[PDB]
Write a protein that holds these residues in place. Structure first.
Motif, short mmCIF file in Angstrom:
data_model
loop_
_atom_site.label_atom_id
_atom_site.label_comp_id
_atom_site.label_asym_id
_atom_site.label_seq_id
_atom_site.Cartn_x
_atom_site.Cartn_y
_atom_site.Cartn_z
N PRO A 1 6.94 60.86 29.67
CA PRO A 1 6.76 62.81 30.22
C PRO A 1 5.70 62.46 30.74
O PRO A 1 5.60 61.32 31.00
CB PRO A 1 6.34 63.34 29.24
N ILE A 2 4.87 63.49 30.86
CA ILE A 2 3.59 63.59 31.74
C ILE A 2 2.75 63.25 31.02
O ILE A 2 2.62 62.57 29.76
CB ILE A 2 4.01 65.58 32.00
N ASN B 1 -6.11 65.53 41.17
CA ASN B 1 -6.58 65.10 40.31
C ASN B 1 -6.83 63.47 39.41
O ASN B 1 -7.42 63.26 41.25
CB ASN B 1 -5.72 65.36 39.42
N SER B 2 -8.12 62.97 38.24
CA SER B 2 -7.87 61.64 38.43
C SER B 2 -7.24 61.19 37.91
O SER B 2 -8.02 60.06 36.92
CB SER B 2 -9.32 62.00 37.57
N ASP B 3 -5.94 62.17 37.20
CA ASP B 3 -4.79 61.40 36.82
C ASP B 3 -4.68 59.80 37.24
O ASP B 3 -4.11 59.46 38.19
CB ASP B 3 -4.19 62.05 36.77
N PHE C 1 -1.86 57.28 35.44
CA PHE C 1 -1.20 56.97 34.24
C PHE C 1 -0.05 56.21 34.34
O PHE C 1 -0.10 55.32 35.26
CB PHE C 1 -0.36 58.44 34.35
#
Ligand SMILES: CC(=O)N[C@@H]1[C@@H](O)[C@H](O[C@@H]2O[C@H](CO)[C@@H](O[C@@H]3O[C@H](CO[C@H]4O[C@H](CO[C@H]5O[C@H](CO)[C@@H](O)[C@H](O)[C@@H]5O)[C@@H](O)[C@H](O[C@H]5O[C@H](CO)[C@@H](O)[C@H](O)[C@@H]5O)[C@@H]4O)[C@@H](O)[C@H](O[C@H]4O[C@H](CO)[C@@H](O)[C@H](O)[C@@H]4O[C@H]4O[C@H](CO)[C@@H](O)[C@H](O)[C@@H]4O)[C@@H]3O)[C@H](O)[C@H]2NC(C)=O)[C@@H](CO)O[C@H]1O
Ligand code: NI
Ligand code: NI
Lengths: 158, 158
Positions: free
Chosen positions: B12-13, B138-140, B142
């Motif tokens: 998922p996210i 954003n700073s995402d 993952f």
């Protein structure tokens, strides 16, 4: 994750600020309690609860106007008591539904011994509460700021 | 941004890990190629493409089990060949549609000279591939980790 007030005012994803106007006891004696139950005013929800968990805290709470000068008090957050004005960040409350649910905060303010006369003028800022949202997926640290205003005067009889 | 496989497994996210079981050519001769086309199994989408564009790379990959012992090979990412095990990050692939689109990864492996008999035992872990998502909003940053397991034996006849 967003937050709305009772009369409709809203704070969007990412944070922001809003004004909450609260009714107060017109008369409160030294030693009695004045209660501001924000659980019936502020409501917040999780915009993707299926996979994500939102974490909400009272980052700080501060007293302004007459509450600062003429009142002692505490704040009750999700079952526990803490001093007000706040000396530390609170434990977390979980938000895991797209349904608007209350923010379980309540202020207990009692006039101090030297209190007397008009202790809160109507329309004045009496506190500011900073709600901090985090989550379990990224580094988001958002601030929802609530400026609390008095809807009426409060008199402490002498 | 999330990723799903054909057989239902999803990450998922925010990222995570998953186990993907792939069917393999039951028999592969020395000098032939064994192909593991993840581009027909893993598919990813962008959950808010109007404002943001997601960036996906093959960050790193490693071989285990019989792929480690009995095969040499390379990995093909979005049209280009790269060493395998990969020790460096690949160029980026863009995702800006809510439509599930493939992760363009495929491994091309050839049995080694001394290979013979069962060279990949069914059910065993054969690789780990790390997909890295970032964005322009954003700073995402993952990691979607894919543990690749063989659905069946693979025999190199001698
Ligand atoms: C008033 C105003 O305009 N305010 C501004 C605000 O609009 C603006 O941003 C966005 O607001 C939209 C309002 O709906 C959001 O739309 C939804 O997003 C949901 C997913 O949210 C999660 O994902 C986003 C994006 O990030 C992830 O995804 C991207 C994309 O790949 C990736 O880069 C990231 O790395 C990450 O993977 C996050 O921002 C969210 O985070 C917020 O919320 C979580 C959860 O509480 C918090 O933890 C977090 O801290 C943030 O507070 C989430 O993580 C979608 O699931 C949602 O889907 C429905 O609606 C679309 C609309 O068409 C459908 O197409 C879709 O199919 C789906 O429909 C289904 O579900 C609906 C209800 O769920 C239902 O009604 C439908 O009928 C159907 O059943 C929707 O797309 C948008 O995400 C917001 N973006 C951002 C970046 O926040 C912000 C941005 O500046 O500014 C405000 O001022
Ligand atoms: Ni919402
Ligand atoms: Ni999605």
């Amino acid at each position: 994750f967003a937050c709305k007030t009772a009369n409709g005012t809203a704070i969007p994803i990412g944070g922001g600020s809003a004004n909450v106007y609260v009714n107060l006891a017109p008369v409160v004696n030294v030693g009695q309690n004045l209660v501001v139950d924000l659980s019936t005013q502020i409501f917040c929800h999780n915009d993707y609860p299926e996979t994500i968990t939102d974490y909400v805290t009272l980052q700080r709470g501060s007293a302004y106007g007459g509450v600062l000068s003429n009142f002692s008090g505490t704040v009750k957050y999700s079952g526990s008591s803490y001093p007000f004005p706040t000396t530390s960040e609170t434990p977390r409350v979980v938000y895991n539904s797209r349904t608007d649910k209350p923010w379980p905060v309540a202020l207990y303010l009692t006039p101090v011994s030297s209190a007397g006369g008009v202790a809160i003028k109507a329309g004045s800022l009496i506190a500011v509460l900073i709600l901090r949202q985090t989550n379990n997926y990224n580094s988001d640290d958002f601030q929802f700021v609530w400026n609390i205003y008095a809807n009426n005067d409060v008199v402490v009889p002498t």
